[PDB]
Amino acid sequence: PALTKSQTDRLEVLLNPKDEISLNSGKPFRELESELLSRRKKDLQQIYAEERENYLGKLEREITRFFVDRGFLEIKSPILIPLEYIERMGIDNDTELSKQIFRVDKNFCLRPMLAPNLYNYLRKLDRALPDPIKIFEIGPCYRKESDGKEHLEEFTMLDFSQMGSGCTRENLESIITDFLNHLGIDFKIVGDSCMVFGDTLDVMHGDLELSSAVVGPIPLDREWGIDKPWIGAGFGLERLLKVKHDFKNIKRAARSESYYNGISTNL
Amino acid sequence: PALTKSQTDRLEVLLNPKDEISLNSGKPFRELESELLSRRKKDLQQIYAEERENYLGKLEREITRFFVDRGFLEIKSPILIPLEYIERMGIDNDTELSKQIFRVDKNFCLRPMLAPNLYNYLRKLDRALPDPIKIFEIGPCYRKESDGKEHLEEFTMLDFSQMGSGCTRENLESIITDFLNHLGIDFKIVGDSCMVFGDTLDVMHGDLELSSAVVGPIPLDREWGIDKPWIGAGFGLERLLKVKHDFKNIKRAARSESYYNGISTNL
Ligand SMILES: Nc1ncnc2c1ncn2[C@@H]1O[C@H](COP(=O)(O)OP(=O)(O)NP(=O)(O)O)[C@@H](O)[C@H]1O
Ligand SMILES: Nc1ncnc2c1ncn2[C@@H]1O[C@H](COP(=O)(O)OP(=O)(O)NP(=O)(O)O)[C@@H](O)[C@H]1O
Ligand SMILES: N[C@@H](Cc1ccccc1Cl)C(=O)O
Ligand SMILES: N[C@@H](Cc1ccccc1Cl)C(=O)O
Numbered sequence: 001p002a003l004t005k006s007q008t009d010r011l012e013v014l015l016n017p018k019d020e021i022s023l024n025s026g027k028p029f030r031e032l033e034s035e036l037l038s039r040r041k042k043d044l045q046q047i048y049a050e051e052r053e054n055y056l057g058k059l060e061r062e063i064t065r066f067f068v069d070r071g072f073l074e075i076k077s078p079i080l081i082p083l084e085y086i087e088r089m090g091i092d093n094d095t096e097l098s099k100q101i102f103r104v105d106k107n108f109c110l111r112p113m114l115a116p117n118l119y120n121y122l123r124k125l126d127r128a129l130p131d132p133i134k135i136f137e138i139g140p141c142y143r144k145e146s147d148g149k150e151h152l153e154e155f156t157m158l159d160f161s162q163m164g165s166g167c168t169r170e171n172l173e174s175i176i177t178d179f180l181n182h183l184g185i186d187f188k189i190v191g192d193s194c195m196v197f198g199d200t201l202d203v204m205h206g207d208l209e210l211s212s213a214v215v216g217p218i219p220l221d222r223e224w225g226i227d228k229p230w231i232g233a234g235f236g237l238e239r240l241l242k243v244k245h246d247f248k249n250i251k252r253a254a255r256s257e258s259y260y261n262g263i264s265t266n267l
Numbered sequence: 268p269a270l271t272k273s274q275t276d277r278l279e280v281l282l283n284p285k286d287e288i289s290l291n292s293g294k295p296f297r298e299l300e301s302e303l304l305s306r307r308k309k310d311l312q313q314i315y316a317e318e319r320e321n322y323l324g325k326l327e328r329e330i331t332r333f334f335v336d337r338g339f340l341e342i343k344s345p346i347l348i349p350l351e352y353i354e355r356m357g358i359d360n361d362t363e364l365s366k367q368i369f370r371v372d373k374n375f376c377l378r379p380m381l382a383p384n385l386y387n388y389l390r391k392l393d394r395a396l397p398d399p400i401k402i403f404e405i406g407p408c409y410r411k412e413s414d415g416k417e418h419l420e421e422f423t424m425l426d427f428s429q430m431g432s433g434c435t436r437e438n439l440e441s442i443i444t445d446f447l448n449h450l451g452i453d454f455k456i457v458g459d460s461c462m463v464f465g466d467t468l469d470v471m472h473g474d475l476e477l478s479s480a481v482v483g484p485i486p487l488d489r490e491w492g493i494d495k496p497w498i499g500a501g502f503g504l505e506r507l508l509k510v511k512h513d514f515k516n517i518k519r520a521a522r523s524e525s526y527y528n529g530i531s532t533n534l
Contacts (some may be wrong), residue, residue, distance in 0.1 A: 011464055034309075044392070052340045074320050074325075075317055076323045079346075080369070104377070110371070128311050129312060140407070142347065
């Protein structure tokens, strides 16, 4: 007959992009599932025998090397941050980002973004390091958005910043260009046409936003004690993974108990 | 005169054990503070100019290389986990670690250990991978215990497990020995003298517990679908860093806005 929805869902979970098998012919739901199962089992086994690195962790280690080798300091800051940091980010309790905050206790939350801890480091480091100040962080970030397709509730941000001299948009577009060229991902920076400083740039791969990027100074810097030019960009690693491996669903790239390196773990 | 308490706190924040400056003599507080501010500013400059890797990230990457080399698959599983996983770990709403949990919504919590997600990986991978199953994860864990001196509220665990053949106490002690020999840390393993399976092991550095390790099976295995022998050990990376760098206070090893690579950021 014709594959029911559960049979369709079940095969979509077992399918990978490299799979060539004819997913429409005379075979029952159930040759097809068994075939994919055998393919996905051999995929885990090959992983276990020859590689054994997690994709999310591996990409994290590769991005780290890129920025360290470019003069950027590697920051590991708290994931649990004061709720007051969200307030000085300008996310008041009527904005749309305001409703996506995982609160913990009364006073704390899971950081939805890396910027506020990075604002603080930039302020403290400016007392001890020579111009310009270049820092970056990679790590977990949380938001109650999960439209499922392009959006996770638990994801991994990269965020880098330069502060002081050299902080132009053509320098910022030159860092993003080397980064994505090193990753092997094509892009496409949209924004205002003749924007010098102050406004955001988007890094696109198709209809997929890989990053929002900022050419400071911006009025928010005063709330953080930052008084200096700066440029910076935030990238979601799961979207990057989605691009390199052609994942259909971004959940294939996330921290998970259901997928490992894009392979279903329910075999 | 003799130092006040705000003054003594200031010098302890700026001190490092490599320092030989005599914290007791005829010098004024400001003279000692300025020497230390000098030493610490140059420590970060040297870090920014030539090193640039964070101690916590860098230690995480080297532990991964070690365990991948030995045949352990690298896992990246969720940090926000269901509250029900906690109770299935033997913490009822009456136990001691139950009060220390960071609840997020009404269902989920910040994981205080890696065991539940690793249980699920062990059960799922048995299906697909040959005997024995060897896995490990490194990442954030959250406990409301933080007496400060040796506990952190936000910390980083390594947790490794083998399941199937080779799950003997002898081979659990051999892994741990190779690992701490690799990281250059003296240790001693305390346990039941005649314990074969079922009980825990404490790996100690003097008074500081580095790890609790387990020679399964244990009764808890029923709740996670595990019916094979296994061995496992959980380790704290900030504790490892505290011993390796002789940190007086474990705060200096953590995710923090206050200390970079053991060095205060308030200079
Ligand atoms: N929920 C999410 N899941 C995955 N990646 C995300 C998520 N939110 C943000 N990112 C990534 O983080 C980058 C910088 O964050 P940000 O600019 O705050 O996102 P954004 O502007 O809200 N765009 P979008 O996440 O599509 O709505 C984005 O360009 C994405 O690559
Ligand atoms: N709050 C914490 N801060 C830092 N490290 C921790 C913390 N809790 C646990 N660890 C580390 O994680 C390892 C495995 O966790 P676990 O065995 O559950 O801790 P434990 O048995 O309660 N030992 P302890 O919490 O010191 O009494 C321990 O050996 C510690 O090295
Ligand atoms: N909002 C920033 C993050 C950030 C915060 C403070 C200072 C610099 C940066 Cl890149 C971004 O879009 O990358
Ligand atoms: N309870 C373990 C962690 C764990 C749980 C389930 C399966 C394997 C392991 Cl190592 C420990 O504390 O070592």
